[PDB]
Amino acid sequence: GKPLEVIKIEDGVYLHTSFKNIEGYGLVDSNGLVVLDNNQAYIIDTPWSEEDTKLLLSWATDRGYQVMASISTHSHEDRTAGIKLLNSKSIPTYTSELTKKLLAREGKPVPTHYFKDDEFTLGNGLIELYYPGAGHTEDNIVAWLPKSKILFGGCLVRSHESEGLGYVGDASISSWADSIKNIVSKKYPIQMVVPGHGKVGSSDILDHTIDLAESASN
Amino acid sequence: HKPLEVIKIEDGVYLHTSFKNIEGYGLVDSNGLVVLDNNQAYIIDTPWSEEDTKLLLSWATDRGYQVMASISTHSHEDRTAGIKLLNSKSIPTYTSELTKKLLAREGKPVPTHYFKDDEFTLGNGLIELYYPGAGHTEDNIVAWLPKSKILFGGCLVRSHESEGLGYVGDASISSWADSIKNIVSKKYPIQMVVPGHGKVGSSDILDHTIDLAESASNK
Ligand SMILES: [Zn+2]
Ligand SMILES: [Zn+2]
């Protein structure tokens, strides 16, 4: 069969990490966040398994948190599992309108809620969502947390120690550098960047990511 | 999803390579072989999925080949997901006894044939199968092709480019080096070693794999 892990990375911000076995390669890890506003919880990108999502919801309800919503950063396979489960529990699920329509076109579970512009904030200013343009996928969005000064980049960003753009099957490689530069133009006072895969780091992760992007489109 | 590739690597020996998309990491490859004996084809490890297995069968039958048998090197899927499909088409499927019983214990489709000893041959001498000991898994076997002088090591061996042992969830790391030394003790005149993942190489792959095993075992 290794199980979901949750760890505190700031006050009211927890990193959750799930694991899959890759035959021939080893273990690949995947991150998202739980963000607390008092005792209300928000999930950014659920575990890829419906199983590990189940465990994440229990992680929260066992601490007396009320899970208010989930946000999914894009439409890929691993982001669907949680949507279906949280829909079933009447927990509000959010994506961009575009991500929602992509999911519906692919016959996948759709979120119950969705925002239409390129910016949207959740909680009472707790989570600022932003669509910076195509990169990892055509629809990928990021989440900015103004209080903790953390950017959740998901797979649109690559961690420091990692050396490629990851799964690029649905990527817009020649658009990617420009999309990271759009995040940069927000002039968020970024203190930490959480990638979809790998270790958390500083704002450097964005520069690192443009390097990989600019290299590959050559 | 990138589809099955098949390429000739020796007279009568073809490398088949199947791909999976790994979110966060990229594309991973998995290798097996097809070995021909005139019109008769033998598959060493099926492809990773049923769909790619289907493509492998069509690759062979579009060429007029008769698929006589498959052999799977252990009870993990990148070796066995094709057993159900071949079973449906009444194509004999083989594993060791231990691999067969592991599959059955896990409620997985089992091969229609198996062998009991540490050695077995298929295709009347074409393919020599050997169980060297635990490593990648408790049950992993290798395949020696005396004509083409190819060793198929599967995930018991690691390509040069690989700097780790791969998926070690079911591994016996402290036994792994000995198990490779057991292969080496066979004195096969090895010209090429085909790993389960990554590029084909020479007998040096075996030394590389020993290095990796010994390093991980020290911890
Ligand atoms: Zn993705
Ligand atoms: Zn295996």
Side-chain angles (χ1 to χ4, degrees), chain A residues 1-24 26-115 118-162 164-186 188-218, chain B residues 1-39 41-76 78-116 118-160 162 164-219:
Chain A
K2 85 153 95 161
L4 184 72
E5 293 177 3
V6 186
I7 68 187
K8 178 182 193 181
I9 60 172
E10 249 272 51
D11 219 72
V13 184
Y14 299 69
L15 180 80
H16 59 81
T17 307
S18 41
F19 309 86
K20 274 186 153 67
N21 309 310
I22 300 312
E23 171 75 335
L27 283 192
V28 176
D29 60 277
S30 169
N31 308 316
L33 303 175
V34 182
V35 180
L36 310 176
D37 187 346
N38 295 313
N39 250 74
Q40 292 167 334
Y42 293 76
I43 297 163
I44 297 165
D45 276 351
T46 52
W48 30 39
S49 22
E50 169 154 309
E51 170 52 15
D52 282 14
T53 299
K54 251 164 185 157
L55 302 178
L56 186 61
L57 296 172
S58 283
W59 177 95
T61 53
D62 280 347
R63 297 172 162 65
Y65 302 140
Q66 191 189 337
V67 184
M68 301 298 281
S70 70
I71 308 164
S72 303
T73 57
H74 58 308
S75 68
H76 271 168
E77 178 69 34
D78 289 4
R79 301 322 183 195
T80 53
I83 289 192
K84 181 206 199 174
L85 173 51
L86 274 68
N87 287 347
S88 81
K89 291 152 146 287
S90 295
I91 295 160
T93 52
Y94 283 80
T95 68
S96 72
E97 156 165 298
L98 167 59
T99 294
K100 169 244 179 169
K101 298 239 195 163
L102 295 180
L103 281 168
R105 191 165 301 274
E106 277 283 59
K108 308 176 129 174
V110 290
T112 49
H113 299 64
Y114 46 93
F115 60 94
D118 286 335
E119 287 123 54
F120 176 68
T121 127
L122 268 204
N124 201 83
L126 188 85
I127 303 166
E128 294 177 15
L129 306 174
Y130 179 50
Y131 171 70
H136 167 59
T137 58
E138 64 188 294
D139 59 326
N140 46 213
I141 63 164
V142 296
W144 170 240
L145 310 181
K147 169 175 187 73
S148 53
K149 287 170 204 200
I150 296 166
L151 181 74
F152 187 79
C155 268
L156 180 53
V157 308
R158 312 291 296 167
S159 72
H160 232 235
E161 94 93 356
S162 77
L165 289 167
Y167 171 61
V168 294
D170 300 300
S172 290
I173 298 156
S174 67
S175 294
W176 198 322
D178 291 331
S179 294
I180 299 300
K181 285 185 227 216
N182 274 357
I183 296 167
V184 175
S185 288
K186 285 289 180 187
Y188 298 139
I190 303 170
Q191 126 175 313
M192 291 150 58
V193 171
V194 182
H197 164 90
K199 301 195 176 186
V200 182
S202 68
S203 55
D204 258 320
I205 275 175
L206 298 187
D207 302 276
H208 176 29
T209 289
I210 281 140
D211 291 337
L212 270 39
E214 285 185 341
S215 298
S217 72
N218 305 336
Chain B
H1 168 98
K2 190 182 189 148
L4 186 85
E5 300 181 357
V6 185
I7 187 174
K8 180 175 189 83
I9 59 174
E10 252 288 3
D11 219 278
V13 187
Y14 301 69
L15 183 76
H16 65 80
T17 301
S18 46
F19 305 84
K20 295 199 153 166
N21 298 317
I22 316 306
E23 178 83 324
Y25 177 81
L27 201 58
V28 183
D29 61 295
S30 179
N31 303 310
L33 302 175
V34 191
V35 185
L36 303 184
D37 179 54
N38 301 120
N39 239 31
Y42 295 76
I43 300 171
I44 302 169
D45 279 338
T46 63
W48 225 332
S49 74
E50 185 164 276
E51 226 48 35
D52 280 323
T53 296
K54 283 182 211 178
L55 293 183
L56 185 60
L57 293 180
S58 295
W59 179 93
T61 60
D62 285 353
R63 288 159 174 73
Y65 303 146
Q66 183 192 13
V67 182
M68 299 295 295
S70 74
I71 168 80
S72 309
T73 61
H74 61 291
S75 75
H76 290 174
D78 69 321
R79 324 283 94 181
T80 50
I83 287 178
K84 181 193 168 57
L85 183 78
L86 273 61
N87 280 352
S88 84
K89 298 188 163 214
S90 299
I91 297 169
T93 50
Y94 292 72
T95 70
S96 73
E97 181 169 23
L98 169 56
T99 293
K100 186 277 208 175
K101 293 225 179 184
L102 290 179
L103 293 159
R105 186 164 301 284
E106 289 294 354
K108 286 282 149 122
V110 297
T112 56
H113 300 90
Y114 68 103
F115 67 93
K116 290 184 170 60
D118 286 337
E119 282 124 318
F120 188 66
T121 77
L122 272 178
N124 299 297
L126 181 76
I127 305 168
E128 311 193 357
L129 303 175
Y130 171 56
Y131 173 72
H136 170 248
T137 56
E138 62 200 287
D139 61 319
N140 43 218
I141 66 172
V142 301
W144 169 240
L145 307 180
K147 181 191 196 266
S148 60
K149 297 175 189 180
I150 301 179
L151 185 75
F152 189 79
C155 272
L156 182 57
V157 313
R158 311 289 297 160
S159 65
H160 272 127
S162 300
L165 295 169
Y167 174 66
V168 299
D170 299 311
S172 297
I173 290 177
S174 59
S175 309
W176 194 324
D178 292 339
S179 297
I180 302 294
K181 290 180 208 192
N182 281 3
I183 307 179
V184 169
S185 296
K186 286 288 191 170
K187 230 106 193 68
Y188 297 135
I190 302 176
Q191 185 173 298
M192 301 161 46
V193 174
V194 180
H197 150 76
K199 293 197 174 128
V200 178
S202 65
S203 59
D204 256 46
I205 280 185
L206 299 189
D207 305 75
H208 180 53
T209 301
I210 289 173
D211 285 339
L212 293 175
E214 292 184 325
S215 283
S217 208
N218 294 343
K219 304 220 154 289

